[PDB]
Design an enzyme around this catalytic site. Structure first.
Site, mmCIF file in Angstrom:
data_model
loop_
_atom_site.group_PDB
_atom_site.id
_atom_site.type_symbol
_atom_site.label_atom_id
_atom_site.label_comp_id
_atom_site.label_asym_id
_atom_site.label_seq_id
_atom_site.Cartn_x
_atom_site.Cartn_y
_atom_site.Cartn_z
ATOM 1 N N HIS A 112 0.835 -1.203 0.000
ATOM 2 C CA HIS A 112 0.000 0.000 0.000
ATOM 3 C C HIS A 112 0.883 1.272 0.000
ATOM 4 O O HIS A 112 0.696 2.208 -0.774
ATOM 5 C CB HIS A 112 -0.953 -0.035 1.244
ATOM 6 C CG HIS A 112 -1.820 1.182 1.369
ATOM 7 N ND1 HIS A 112 -3.163 1.219 1.047
ATOM 8 C CD2 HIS A 112 -1.521 2.429 1.817
ATOM 9 C CE1 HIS A 112 -3.635 2.463 1.310
ATOM 10 N NE2 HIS A 112 -2.689 3.254 1.787
ATOM 11 N N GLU A 113 1.853 1.318 0.887
ATOM 12 C CA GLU A 113 2.722 2.489 0.979
ATOM 13 C C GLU A 113 3.433 2.788 -0.336
ATOM 14 O O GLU A 113 3.525 3.939 -0.765
ATOM 15 C CB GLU A 113 3.737 2.307 2.126
ATOM 16 C CG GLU A 113 3.170 2.397 3.570
ATOM 17 C CD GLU A 113 1.978 3.395 3.740
ATOM 18 O OE1 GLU A 113 2.088 4.591 3.442
ATOM 19 O OE2 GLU A 113 0.898 2.924 4.186
ATOM 20 N N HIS A 116 1.750 4.767 -2.839
ATOM 21 C CA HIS A 116 1.882 6.192 -2.584
ATOM 22 C C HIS A 116 3.233 6.720 -3.098
ATOM 23 O O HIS A 116 3.303 7.783 -3.715
ATOM 24 C CB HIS A 116 1.795 6.510 -1.065
ATOM 25 C CG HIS A 116 0.431 6.337 -0.463
ATOM 26 N ND1 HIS A 116 -0.739 6.762 -1.062
ATOM 27 C CD2 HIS A 116 0.068 5.810 0.737
ATOM 28 C CE1 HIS A 116 -1.755 6.502 -0.242
ATOM 29 N NE2 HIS A 116 -1.337 5.925 0.867
ATOM 30 N N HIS A 122 -5.369 7.352 -2.294
ATOM 31 C CA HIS A 122 -6.358 6.349 -1.917
ATOM 32 C C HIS A 122 -7.483 6.102 -2.938
ATOM 33 O O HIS A 122 -7.877 6.970 -3.701
ATOM 34 C CB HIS A 122 -6.977 6.731 -0.574
ATOM 35 C CG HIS A 122 -6.051 6.527 0.563
ATOM 36 N ND1 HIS A 122 -5.872 7.429 1.591
ATOM 37 C CD2 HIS A 122 -5.219 5.488 0.824
ATOM 38 C CE1 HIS A 122 -4.963 6.922 2.417
ATOM 39 N NE2 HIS A 122 -4.552 5.742 1.976
HETATM 40 ZN ZN LIG Z 1 -2.451 5.115 2.479
#
Ligand SMILES: [Zn+2]
Ligand SMILES: [Ca+2]
Ligand SMILES: [Ca+2]
Ligand SMILES: [Zn+2]
Length: 157
Positions: A112-113, A116, A122
């Site tokens: 997930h990170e 980014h 998101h």
């Molecule tokens: Zn996040």
């Protein structure tokens, strides 16, 4: 905001004692590969030196103005593509990090990170890896959900 280069380096600056160093490295390597198989990006690990993406486990105040909050709550954060702190990912050293179904699973959170660090924000789709809140999903042969593929494909190709 996107990386203007396709082969990017990463460095694991420190580790969490909760898992072996091999397990942390494996979690991170596998997390990067999910994005790799869906984009033109290639990730190379370095052991020292200046990498594009620095990865680290930090507690509370840790020099970037976004302090962590102890157990649960904020799990990790990542900077958008850019020089310096740009693209770096910090993990809350106060969390319980695992490679099981128990909260939490380092590979899923790292994955997930990195979205980014690559420029994704998101998703509103609850089945997406980029959904704001953490949810466990089988990791054994994990593949990127379709919403996330659409996501990096829209940025890179
Ligand atoms: Zn996040
Ligand atoms: Ca926390
Ligand atoms: Ca950086
Ligand atoms: Zn931070």
């Amino acid at each position: 905001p996107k990386w203007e280069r396709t082969n990017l380096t990463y460095r694991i600056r420190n580790y969490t004692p909760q898992l072996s160093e091999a397990e942390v490295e494996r979690a991170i390597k596998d997390a990067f590969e999910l994005w790799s198989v869906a984009s033109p990006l290639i990730f190379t690990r370095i052991s020292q030196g200046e990498a594009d993406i620095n990865i680290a486990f930090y507690q509370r105040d840790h020099g970037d103005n976004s302090p962590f909050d102890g157990p649960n709550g904020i799990l990790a954060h990542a900077f958008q593509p850019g020089q310096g702190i740009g693209g770096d990912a910090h993990f809350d050293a106060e969390e319980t990090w695992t490679n099981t179904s128990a909260n939490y699973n380092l590979f899923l959170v790292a994955a997930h990170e990195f979205g980014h660090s690559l420029g994704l924000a998101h998703s509103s789709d609850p089945g997406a890896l980029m959904y704001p809140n953490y949810a466990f999903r089988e990791t054994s042969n994990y593949s990127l959900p379709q919403d996330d593929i659409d996501g990096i494909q829209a940025i890179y190709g």
